[PDB]
Design a protein around this ligand. Sequence first.
Ligand SMILES: COc1cc(OC[C@@H](O)CO)c(Cl)cc1NC(=O)CSc1ccc(C(=O)O)cn1
Ligand SMILES: COc1cc(OC[C@@H](O)CO)c(Cl)cc1NC(=O)CSc1ccc(C(=O)O)cn1
Ligand SMILES: COc1cc(OC[C@@H](O)CO)c(Cl)cc1NC(=O)CSc1ccc(C(=O)O)cn1
Ligand SMILES: COc1cc(OC[C@@H](O)CO)c(Cl)cc1NC(=O)CSc1ccc(C(=O)O)cn1
Ligand SMILES: O=C(O)COc1cc(F)cc(-c2ccc(C(=O)O)cn2)c1
Ligand SMILES: O=C(O)COc1cc(F)cc(-c2ccc(C(=O)O)cn2)c1
Ligand SMILES: O=C(O)COc1cc(F)cc(-c2ccc(C(=O)O)cn2)c1
Ligand SMILES: O=C(O)COc1cc(F)cc(-c2ccc(C(=O)O)cn2)c1
Lengths: 324, 324, 331, 328
Amino acid sequence: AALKDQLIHNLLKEEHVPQNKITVVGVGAVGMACAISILMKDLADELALVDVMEDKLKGEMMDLQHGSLFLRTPKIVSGKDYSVTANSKLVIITAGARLNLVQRNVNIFKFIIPNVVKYSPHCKLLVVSNPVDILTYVAWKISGFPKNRVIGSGCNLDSARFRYLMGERLGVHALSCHGWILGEHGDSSVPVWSGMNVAGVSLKTLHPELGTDADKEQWKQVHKQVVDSAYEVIKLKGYTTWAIGLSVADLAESIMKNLRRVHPISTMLKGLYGIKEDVFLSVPCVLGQNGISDVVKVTLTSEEEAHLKKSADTLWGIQKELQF
Amino acid sequence: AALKDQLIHNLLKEEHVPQNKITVVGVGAVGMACAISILMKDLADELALVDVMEDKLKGEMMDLQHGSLFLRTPKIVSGKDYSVTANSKLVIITAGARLNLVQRNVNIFKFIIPNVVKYSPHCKLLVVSNPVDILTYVAWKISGFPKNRVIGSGCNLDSARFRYLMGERLGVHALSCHGWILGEHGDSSVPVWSGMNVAGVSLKTLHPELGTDADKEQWKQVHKQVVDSAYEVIKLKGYTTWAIGLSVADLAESIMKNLRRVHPISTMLKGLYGIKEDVFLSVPCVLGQNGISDVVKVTLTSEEEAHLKKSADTLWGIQKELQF
Amino acid sequence: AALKDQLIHNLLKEEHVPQNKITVVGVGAVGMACAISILMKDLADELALVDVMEDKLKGEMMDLQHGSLFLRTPKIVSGKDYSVTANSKLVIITAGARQQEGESRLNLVQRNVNIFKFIIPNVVKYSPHCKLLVVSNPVDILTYVAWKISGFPKNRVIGSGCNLDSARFRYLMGERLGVHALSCHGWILGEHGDSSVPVWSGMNVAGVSLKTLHPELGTDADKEQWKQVHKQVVDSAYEVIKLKGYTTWAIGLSVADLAESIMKNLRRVHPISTMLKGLYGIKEDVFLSVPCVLGQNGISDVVKVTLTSEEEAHLKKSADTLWGIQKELQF
Amino acid sequence: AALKDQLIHNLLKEEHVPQNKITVVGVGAVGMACAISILMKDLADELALVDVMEDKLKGEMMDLQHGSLFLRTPKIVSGKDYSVTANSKLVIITAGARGESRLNLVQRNVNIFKFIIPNVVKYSPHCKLLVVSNPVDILTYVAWKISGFPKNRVIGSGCNLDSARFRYLMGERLGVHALSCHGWILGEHGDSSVPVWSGMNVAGVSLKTLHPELGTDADKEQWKQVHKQVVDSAYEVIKLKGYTTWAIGLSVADLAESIMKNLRRVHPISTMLKGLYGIKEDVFLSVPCVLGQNGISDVVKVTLTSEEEAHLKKSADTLWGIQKELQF
Ligand SMILES: COc1cc(OC[C@@H](O)CO)c(Cl)cc1NC(=O)CSc1ccc(C(=O)O)cn1
Ligand SMILES: COc1cc(OC[C@@H](O)CO)c(Cl)cc1NC(=O)CSc1ccc(C(=O)O)cn1
Ligand SMILES: COc1cc(OC[C@@H](O)CO)c(Cl)cc1NC(=O)CSc1ccc(C(=O)O)cn1
Ligand SMILES: COc1cc(OC[C@@H](O)CO)c(Cl)cc1NC(=O)CSc1ccc(C(=O)O)cn1
Ligand SMILES: O=C(O)COc1cc(F)cc(-c2ccc(C(=O)O)cn2)c1
Ligand SMILES: O=C(O)COc1cc(F)cc(-c2ccc(C(=O)O)cn2)c1
Ligand SMILES: O=C(O)COc1cc(F)cc(-c2ccc(C(=O)O)cn2)c1
Ligand SMILES: O=C(O)COc1cc(F)cc(-c2ccc(C(=O)O)cn2)c1
C-alpha cells in the first residue's frame, strides 16, 4: 500500500463544503494586503484569489501556501476561473483598470460580478475599487443582490486615518479618539465636526471654531491631510497597501463574526438623508452576517445635509451615463 | 418615536441562524473554563450554555455577557430548555453525576443527548465527562450519530501534560517536545516511548532503557506523574479546570477551522489496532469540520498492542452492564 | 551522560531575567480569572501568583502549567514568599477579607488595610518599579491605601474603579440599541458602586449624542427610563452574586484589557480610579474614576469631562465620604 | 487655552523608553512582509524601519501608521539615521544588493553590512541580530564577525522557511495540516541543504521505518523530490511573481515571537556551529536551536548518517573557502 495508507487509515468519505470561505478578486497591492490581513486574523477556513494575471496569481497563491505552518487557514486556492470562488461568504473586489475610465471598470465588473454571483449566490460583496461609491453601485446593479449584501469600503480607511491623525494631536491612541468622515469617498467627503470626541467630550463644544477658517488650530487641515494622504503615500512608495488592507479585514471581521459593529462604509441610501437617487454614500452602518442591516441617522448641520445631497446628485449624474 | 428609532434606521428585517454556534453542556468548573477559553479564542459567533442548575446557569451567562466589550462573540445564551442550543456546529458535554456511578451518568446522557440531537441534528459531539471513553460510547449509542461526529477528549490533555513535563526535563517548550499517550484514558493509558523526540531525534534510540524499570533516569515515573496529576491538583485546589479547558478549546479550533490537525482523542476504533469491539480509545486522530475522518496507524510493540486490546475488553465489559 | 546532555548541547549559561512579568496577588475567583485572561492575551512572558493559601496556590499554578502547550507564556510561578514576584512590570491586587456576620463594613475595610500593610511593602520590595493595579473592594479606598503604603508616585498606582461598570453600561446600552457594545459609548465615573455617575451627555453611537436626540435621557421624567440602565449597572454585581455566588469572567476580562494598555504602552482612555485631588473640583486626597490615558508609566493624563453642576456635586460628596472613611483608618 | 490642554490634563512627563522595540533593516518586499507580520502578531510596542531609499521609507512608515486603529503597536518610526533604531531588543537585517559572480555579489553585500551592522551595534548594543539577506549562512557570519557580538546573539533565518515549506508539502501528500507533519532541513541554506529523512514523522510514527526507501532513489513515491521541490520553490515563485514575501515574513515573525516571549521553541536556524556536528571552521549552518530572549541558547544534536555528516562538512568547506576570500 502507498505510504499514506500505511500511516493513515481513512474512516470517512470527505465532502469539502467550505464554511467560512472568503475570496479576494485581484491580487494587486491592495488585494494581497487584504489577503494577508485576513489570513493573519484567522477569519476564513478557506481563501480564494482570482485574477486574469495567471502567473502572478499562481505565485501569490504559492507564496501564501508556503506559510501554512504559521497560519490557521487550512486551504488557499487560486485560478482565472471563478469555480475556485464557489460558496464564498464574502467576496472582496479589488479589481480595476489602469479619458474617463469608469465604463471600462464597468466593463470589468460586467464580466467579474456575474461570474461571482454564479459561484457564490448567497455571498456578501465588498467593493474596494475606486471610484468606490460608483463601482459599488455598479456591482449592486449587475449582481441582482438586495442592497444589504453589497458594501463599499467607502470612508472606512479615511475615518481610520482621521482618528490616527486626531490621536497624534491629542496624544492618545486612535482607538480612544472618535471621529467620522462620511459622504462621498475622496475630496468631497464630510468631516463631521460635531461628532469628534474623547471619552464623550465633544471637541466642537469645547472649541466652537473647530474645523472653520477662523480655527487657530487649523483642524480643517486634518481633514485636508486625510483627503491627500493617499496621493502623498502614492507619491512616496507608488501605491498604498497595508492600511487599506487592514481596514478591509476589520470589515470582514464584523461580517464573518456577525459583530454588528458600526463602520463608516458605503451603502445604498436612497430613502435616507434626504436622498432620492439610487447611489451609495458612507454613513455609520451596522455591519454583520447579513451585510448592512441598519444605519445610524446622524444629526447633520443644514450645509452638511446639502453637501450629502450634492454628492448624491454628483454620483448619479455620472451613473446616468454608464451602460450595463 | 423611540430613541432607538431616532438613532437607527432599520434597513433589513432578518432572521437568526448562527453560522458558528458552540454549546457547552454543564456550567461547572470544567464547562465554564471551556467556555471562557472558547470565547477568548474567537471560535464562535454564538455560545449557548445549558445545565439544570438554573440560577448558576443564568449567573454564569450574565457574567460572560458583561464582558462583551472585550470579546468578539456577539451572542451568548443559556437555558434549561435545549432549544437554546439549536443549530450548533459543536456541542461539548461536561455533564455528569459503587459503580453504577456510570449508570447514573448513563441516565443523565439518556436525557441530555436526545435533547442535544433534536435541536442540532448535524452537530459534532465532544464528550469530556469522565469516565470519558465509556461516556463517549454512550452518547454515540444514544445519539445515533455516525462515529466521525462523536468525539471524546480522551488522552488529549494527558499528552499535553506529558509534553509539558518532558520540556521541563529537557529545558525546551512543550510545543517543541513530542510524545503521545494513547488508548484508555486514566491509569491504563499507554506512553508510546518510541515516539518521543525533539526535532525528530528519537529519545528511545539515544537511550534504549527509556521508560523501563532499569531506566536510571526513571522516565516511567513521568507517565505515572501524568496519570496522577488530576488527583494531585484536585488534592490541592478541589478540581481541575484551566488546563482541560485550554485543551478542549484547542480541539474546538481544529473542528471550527477544519484544520485537519492530528490530536490524541478517543474515537470508535472497531476494526483498527486489532480491536473488534464497539469501544472508544485515544489514537492519533485527524480532526476537522467533519469530526474525526482519519486515524494515524501507530506502530505499536506487541506489548503495546495487547495493552490496547486489554483496554478494549475491559471497556466492553463495562459497557455490557449498562441499561439503555 | 544524561539524556538531556546527549540530546541537547548547551551553549549559554542562562541568568534568567523576566522582561514582561506580571504578578497576580490572590488566587480566588477574581485573581484566577485575571490570570487566565492575561495568559490568553499573551501579555506577559512570566506570570507569578501569591496568596496565603498554599495548597490552593500550588493547585492553580500546576493547573495553568499543564496548559502550557496551548499558551505563549513560558514561565508560570507561585509561592507564599514574594521573592517569586521580583521584577514585575505589573502587580494586580485582588486580596481581601470576606466579611463575617457580624463585623461592620468599616472594620472589614480595616482588616483589608491590615492585609495591604503586609502585602504592599512586600510587593514594593521585590518590584520597586512595578505598576500597581488594585481590584479589591472597596476599590477607590483600597487603592488610596495601596498608594499611601507603597510610596509610589501616583501615576503608578491605579484602581480598576468604574472600568467594568462602564463596559457593563455599554453592553446594556447595545442591548437596547441593537448594536455591539464596542460601538456604544458611555461613561460611568466617580465613585465605584451605588454613587457612580452615568455621564449622560457623553453617551453616543457614531458620535451622535443620545442626549441631544432625547433630552429626557436619564431624567426622572424620561419615558424610556434610561436611568434604570445605570441602576442595572450598579446592581449587576449583586444580581450575579445572587445567581452564582460571586463574579469572575467579566471583571477578569476588564482587568486584562487594562493590563494590555499598560504592557503595550497604548495610551488608550479607560474609566479607572486615580488620585485626582486638585482636579474635577476635588480638594481631598481621594481616588475617583475619570477617563485616564493608560500606558507603560501608568496613568499619564486624565481627560477633563465637562460635568454638570449636579454631577460635580455628586463627585465632591463622594470625595467627602471617602476622605471621611480614610481618616478613620489605622495605617 | 489650546484644545488638547482644554481636553486633557497632563500629569506625567516623558521618560519614553521602548520596552519591546523591533527594528527591521530594509523596506523591500521581505522587510515590509516581516514588518506587517510582526505588527499583526503584536510582538513589539515600537517598530522602526531603516533604509537608504528615503522616499520609499517615509511612504512605508506612513502606510503602516494609517492602520494604527487596527493595531496594538502604538509607535512606528523610520529614517536613514540609525538613531531611530536605538534600544532595539531585536534587529532584523534584510538589506542587500541584487556574470557578476557569487563572490563579487557577496563582497558588495559585505560592504553594506560594514556600514549597517556597526550602526546597528552603536545604537542597540544588547540587541539580538537576525539576518535574512542571502546568502544567509555567509551574511550571518559577516554580521557576527563585524558586530563583535557573542554567537548566541547573531542568528540567520537559514532553513527555517524551508523546513516549513517541507512540512507543508508533506502535509499535502498526507492529507493533514503542516502543523501535524514533522521534518527537518538542516545544513547550508538552499540546494546543499539536507532533508533529514529519519526525523520525518506524524504522531511520532517514523515515516522512514514504515517506508524504508524514504529519501532514496529506489523510491516509487519519489519522496526525495519533495526536498527538491522545497529547494526550488523559492525561484519558482520568483519566476511567477518576481520575488517572494508573505512566507518569509511569516517565518521571520515566528522566530521573533520565540525571541520576544522567550519561548525556547526549537527552530531550524543558522548558528555558528564550529565544534558541533563535526565542523572545524568558523561557519554558520542551520541546526535545531532553542531560541529565547538571549538568542540561541542551546542546540539539539541530531543523529546524522555518515553521508549526512559528509554533506555538512562539505558545506562548511565551501562556506569557509568563500569567507576566506572576503574583505572586511
Ligand atoms: C484590467 O482588467 C482586470 C483587472 C483586474 O484587477 C487588476 C488589479 O487590480 C489586480 O491584479 C482583474 Cl482582477 C480582472 C480584470 N479583467 C477581467 O476580469 C476580464 S474582463 C475585462 C473587461 C474590460 C477590460 C478593459 O477594458 O481593460 C479588461 N478585462
Ligand atoms: C446531576 O445531573 C446533571 C448534571 C449536569 O452537570 C453537572 C455539572 O457537571 C455541571 O453543573 C447537567 Cl448539565 C445536567 C444534569 N441532569 C439532567 O439533565 C436531567 S437528567 C438526570 C438523570 C439522573 C440524575 C441523577 O441521578 O443525579 C440527574 N439528572
Ligand atoms: C485573609 O487575608 C488574606 C487574603 C488574601 O486573598 C484572599 C482572596 O481574596 C484571594 O484568595 C491574600 Cl492573597 C492574602 C491574605 N493575607 C495576608 O497576606 C497576611 S496579612 C493579614 C492581615 C489581616 C488578616 C485578617 O484580618 O484576616 C489576614 N492576613
Ligand atoms: C544597496 O545598499 C543597501 C540596500 C538596503 O536594502 C535594500 C533592500 O533590501 C530593501 O530596499 C539597505 Cl536597508 C541599505 C543599503 N545601503 C547602505 O546602508 C549604505 S552602505 C552601501 C555600501 C555599498 C553599496 C553597493 O554595493 O552599491 C550600497 N550601500
Ligand atoms: O491594488 C491594485 O491592484 C489596484 O489599485 C487599487 C484597487 C483597490 F481596490 C483599491 C485601491 C485604493 C483605495 C484607497 C486608497 C487610499 O485611500 O490610500 C488607495 N488605493 C487601489
Ligand atoms: O466540572 C464539572 O462540571 C464536573 O466534572 C468534570 C466534567 C468533565 F467533563 C470533565 C472533568 C475532568 C476531566 C479530566 C480532568 C483531569 O485530567 O485533570 C479533570 N476533570 C470533570
Ligand atoms: O475573588 C476573590 O478573591 C475576592 O473577591 C474580590 C476581589 C477583587 F479583587 C475584586 C472583586 C470584585 C470586583 C468587582 C465586582 C463586580 O463589579 O462584579 C465583583 N468582584 C472581588
Ligand atoms: O526583499 C528585499 O528587500 C531584497 O531581497 C531579499 C532580502 C532578504 F533579506 C531575503 C530575501 C529572500 C530570502 C529567501 C527567499 C525564499 O526562500 O523564498 C526569498 N527572498 C530577499
